[PDB]
């Protein structure tokens, strides 16, 4: 019942390496792990709210991604939240190889 729900959450957390936290000021924090294969536990995170106009709004990104404002504009236009999340993860992967 409730056990099956907690089990489903843990399977997604572990297998996608993605945790979702409801934090202060009406925001959800998305935390990706398993990004840097040399440091699987290292998190890459952003936070999101739905703003007073009912729009997606990224309210912070740590570490920063230079494409996330472009992604915010695209998710607003397409409403494709799946692709928004997939593109942010791709962008953290890439960022992890920069320097």
């Amino acid at each position: 019942r409730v056990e099956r729900l907690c089990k489903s959450k843990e399977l997604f957390e572990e297998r996608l390496g993605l945790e979702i936290r409801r934090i202060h000021n009406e925001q959800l924090q998305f935390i990706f792990r398993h990004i840097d294969h040399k440091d699987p536990d290292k998190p890459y995170m952003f936070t999101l709210s739905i703003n007073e106009q009912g729009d997606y709004e990224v309210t912070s990104c740590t570490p920063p991604l230079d494409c996330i404002s472009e992604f915010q504009l695209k998710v607003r236009e397409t409403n494709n939240f799946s692709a928004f999340i997939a593109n942010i993860r791709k962008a953290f992967t890439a960022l992890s190889f920069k320097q």
Partner: protein, 62 residues
């Protein structure tokens, strides 16, 4: 609890098989067109490959 797992479906389009040994990553990935089975042995792979592979199932086109 239900609302978060519902959003993980919205994001990944994956539905897990909850009646299998922990060592088996098994489920189905849904899409426009026909649904695709997943049945992997977690013991054969790193945590990061499992996550990168599962995420590669999710289309990045807007």
């Amino acid at each position: 609890a239900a609302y978060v797992t519902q959003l993980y479906y919205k994001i990944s389009r994956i539905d897990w098989d909850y009646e299998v040994e922990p060592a088996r990553i098994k489920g189905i990935h849904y899409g426009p067109d026909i649904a695709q089975p997943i049945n992997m042995d977690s013991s054969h792979h790193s945590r990061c490959f499992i996550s990168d592979y599962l995420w590669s199932l999710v289309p990045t086109a807007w």
